[PDB]
């Protein structure tokens, strides 16, 4: 199983540096290069650079002065660092591996790291119930006032997926995000089945498990 | 660098149809083009390499063709699970570059929303703010109008909407509208209503609650 797992998302202050770790498994860094790609609103998909199996690096020309990539073969870790970030460096950053040691067809991707460049402060969410009261009931969790993105929401520790909708976050006029996650269930299940929304805001290490049930 | 032009920008199609994505390079790149799919909240997924070569694990309905400057990604019988963005990539010339993407949208029959309203929790109220939420579930098309009325006064400027991407199983949308009020304003009024208009509704649907009931 070839896998690439990246470090978690978070905030970088303007003019400061971004560091991401890519831990690989199922192959050796002595046999394959690892590439870095980012995806931004302003420029879409953009290849940033590569560290080859032998340690050489190539960087895309606009980044040669502020990018450095290193690795530890023995730890299966690749280290990405980019200096002097500005607001428009906000993007999803990926590591990726090609099919062949020398090529650029990216068959394997990390899960991506959302990097937000902002002078603001990290803040964890409050989690409030959206409490129910045709035969189908809707319930949910309101995940309010957090920064930066993202938050993950699951229901019943991932066991409940059918009928779940987790909406895109909205930026409120306060500069903080909010989102809701909802699920529809049989109304006769509200007495005996427990419904828990599991909220994780990794930038602030805030985890909340919130039971949602009809109110008295 | 090589510029890649993808067209159309939005590709709207009916399920079961054959669909074709265009990727055109600013100069000849031989067959050095690769294609990727990106689903909601996902990482890019390699579909086709070197214009036409298949990738292990990718459904057989995906294929590719072309050489020189004009390239085509094809899905021979599109499914709801194909809702995604599609990107081409060239690597005939350093540095490798990507196209801007084509968004694939799927047509389906009209479906009216199911509407649900949620009052603020007492937990939130002791923070000084009230969020009232209106849910429109599993509807098509995406266009819908949600109007808030508080004691029959139309609210303007204090709500925000969020819409999901098209569902990969049934091609519908869902929408959440959040009305934000100070606790003081919330406690001064009684009737809270969400009124929904949509192509699949012959007349508007109103869901409401009375504060303190």
């Amino acid at each position: 199983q070839v896998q690439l797992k990246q470090s978690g998302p978070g905030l970088v202050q303007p003019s400061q540096s971004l560091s991401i770790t890519c831990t690989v498994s199922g192959f050796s860094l002595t046999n394959y290069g690892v590439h870095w790609v980012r995806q931004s609103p302003g420029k879409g998909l953009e290849w940033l650079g590569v560290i080859w199996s032998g340690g050489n690096t190539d960087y895309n020309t606009p980044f040669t002065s502020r990018l450095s990539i290193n690795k530890d073969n023995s730890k299966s870790q690749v280290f990405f660092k980019m200096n002097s970030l500005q607001s428009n460096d906000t993007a999803i950053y990926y590591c990726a591996r090609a099919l062949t040691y020398y090529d650029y067809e990216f068959a394997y991707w990390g899960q991506g790291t959302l990097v937000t460049v902002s002078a603001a402060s990290t803040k964890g969410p409050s989690v409030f119930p959206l409490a129910p009261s045709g035969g189908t009931a809707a319930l949910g969790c309101l995940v309010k006032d957090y920064f930066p993105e993202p938050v993950t929401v699951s229901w019943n520790s991932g066991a409940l997926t059918s009928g779940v909708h987790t909406f895109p976050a909205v930026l409120q006029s306060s500069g903080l995000y909010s989102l809701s996650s909802v699920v529809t269930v049989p109304s006769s299940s509200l007495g005996t089945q427990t419904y828990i929304c599991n909220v994780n805001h990794k930038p602030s290490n805030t985890k909340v498990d919130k039971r949602v049930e009809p109110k008295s | 660098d090589i510029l890649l032009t993808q067209s159309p920008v939005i590709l709207s199609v009916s399920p079961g149809e054959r669909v074709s994505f265009s990727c055109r390079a600013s100069q000849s790149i031989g067959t050095n083009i690769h294609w990727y799919q990106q689903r909601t909240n996902g990482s890019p997924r390699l579909l086709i390499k070197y214009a036409s070569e298949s990738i292990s694990g990718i459904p057989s309905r995906f294929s590719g063709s072309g050489s020189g400057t004009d390239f085509t990604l094809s899905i021979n019988s599109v499914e709801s699970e194909d809702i995604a963005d599609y990107y081409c990539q060239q690597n005939n010339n350093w540095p490798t570059t990507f196209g801007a993407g084509t968004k694939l949208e799927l047509k389906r029959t009209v479906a009216a929303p199911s509407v649900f309203i949620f009052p603020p929790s007492d937990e939130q109220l002791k923070s000084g703010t009230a969020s009232v939420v209106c849910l429109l579930n599993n509807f098509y098309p995406r266009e819908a109008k949600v109007q808030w009325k508080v004691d029959n006064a139309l609210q303007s400027g204090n709500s925000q909407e969020s819409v999901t991407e098209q569902d990969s199983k049934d091609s519908t949308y869902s929408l959440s509208s959040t009305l934000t009020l100070s606790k003081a304003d919330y406690e001064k009024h009684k009737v809270y209503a969400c009124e929904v208009t949509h192509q699949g509704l012959s007349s508007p649907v109103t869901k409401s609650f009375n504060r303190g009931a």
Binding site: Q39, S40, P41, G44, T90, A91, I92, G112, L114, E149, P150, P168, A169 | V9, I10, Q38, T40, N41, G42, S43, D85, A100, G101, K103, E165
Partner: peptide, 12 residues
């Protein structure tokens, strides 16, 4: 369209 990092989808 424009890429939206909250959904990883093109927003048009």
């Amino acid at each position: 369209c424009q890429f939206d990092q909250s959904t990883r989808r093109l927003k048009c």
